[PDB]
């Protein structure tokens, strides 16, 4: 996912605008700040994912 972030953040945006490329597909994804809800501690304080 480091290399996939590097593609989506630095190669994909100048390469999708060139003369000839109409559709692309990356094999991976960029970074996205995931937040992993622990349901025991999310139970501890009377809270929901909402």
């Amino acid at each position: 996912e480091d290399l996939s972030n590097y593609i989506v953040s630095n190669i994909q945006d100048p390469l999708s605008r060139t003369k000839g490329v109409g559709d692309f597909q990356v094999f991976g994804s960029q970074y996205s700040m995931r937040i992993w809800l622990d349901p025991a501690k999310l139970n501890s304080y009377q809270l929901t994912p909402g």
């Binding site: 995931r34 992993w36 304080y45």
Partner: protein, 51 residues
């Protein structure tokens, strides 16, 4: 949440925050070593050599 006493819970007391991919379904791998690639489709009405 935070009470008027001043006792709060943060997001660290519920979840562990860290960066990861936005979807993990596709993970390419090139010739024994970890890698990733972008696939490219040619737009219609254009050429392959010039692209």
């Amino acid at each position: 949440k935070v009470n008027p006493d001043g006792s709060q819970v943060r997001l660290k007391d519920v979840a562990d925050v860290g960066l990861g991919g936005q979807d993990y379904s596709i993970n390419a791998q090139f010739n024994g070593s970890p890698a990733s690639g972008i696939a490219i489709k040619l737009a219609t009405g254009a050429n392959a050599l010039d692209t």
